[PDB]
Unconditional design. Structure first.
Length: 263
């Protein structure tokens, strides 16, 4: 709805920065609404959904197992690793690593998983081989959150991320069990509360993954809809703002409120 575009424009005014927006129909894949759909924005932690998308693809191929234990040392720990720092001696399975990466946005869990699939270059090759020819991952955590202006590294386009997310969740790329496993992780997301979930009515379904980085970078990708069933993909990115995190989260939440109102 056009009214939602008014809020996105209002958001850019409030934040004094760019805001990429795209509303996609999960079913047909038809683009419902868009704003700066083909401009690049830092992916940040939202790439973790794609990372586990690739990990699950390998699980399906038999090249990887969900229960395989991965051991790491203190040398591997990077900033913001709430789950991995508590299991240095115990280690963690591939299933736990993806849960920690998506649900908790654990940075080290992303790096450990990144090495098992071949790193950034392989994740990009995976996305390319599935139709996404623009989304690219170059660095590791936490460097991929730099958000240097005009830097095309570790970025995506709202439209690319939206369609790529749709293919992973509803396409035939992953097995039914893996597609379902991916969404379960996204639904259990416990760090995106201040965003779209706050503007969500009771009974609605929400599977998401937030992103935060330097230079006011903030974003979120989601699959939501009424009656406990997802029916639409929403992708919101913004970078360049000097606004605080609460002000940034408030604007994104307002976009989500408008999105709901004119559903």
């Amino acid at each position: 709805h056009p009214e939602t575009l008014v809020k996105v424009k209002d958001a850019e005014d409030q934040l004094g920065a760019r805001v990429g927006y795209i509303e996609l129909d999960l079913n047909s894949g038809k683009i419902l609404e868009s704003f700066r759909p083909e401009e690049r924005f830092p992916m940040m932690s939202t790439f973790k959904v794609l990372l586990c998308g690739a990990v699950l693809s390998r699980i399906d191929a038999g090249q990887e197992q969900l229960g395989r234990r991965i051991h790491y040392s203190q040398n591997d720990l990077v900033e913001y690793s709430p789950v991995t720092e508590k299991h240095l001696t115990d280690g963690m399975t591939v299933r736990e690593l993806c849960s920690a990466a998506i649900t908790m946005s654990d940075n080290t869990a992303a790096n450990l998983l990144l090495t098992t699939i071949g790193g950034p270059k392989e994740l990009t090759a995976f996305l390319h081989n599935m139709g996404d020819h623009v989304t690219r991952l170059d660095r590791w955590e936490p460097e991929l959150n730099e958000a240097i202006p005009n830097d095309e590294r570790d970025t995506t386009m709202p439209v690319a991320m939206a369609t790529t997310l749709r293919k992973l969740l509803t396409g035939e790329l992953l097995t039914l069990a893996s597609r379902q496993q991916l969404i379960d992780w996204m639904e259990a997301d416990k760090v995106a509360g201040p965003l779209l979930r706050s503007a969500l009515p009771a009974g609605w379904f929400i599977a998401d993954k937030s992103g935060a980085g330097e230079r006011g970078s903030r974003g979120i990708i989601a699959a939501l809809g009424p009656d406990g069933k997802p029916s639409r993909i929403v992708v919101i990115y913004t970078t360049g703002s000097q606004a605080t995190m609460d002000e940034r989260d408030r604007q994104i939440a307002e976009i989500g409120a408008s999105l709901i109102k004119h559903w």
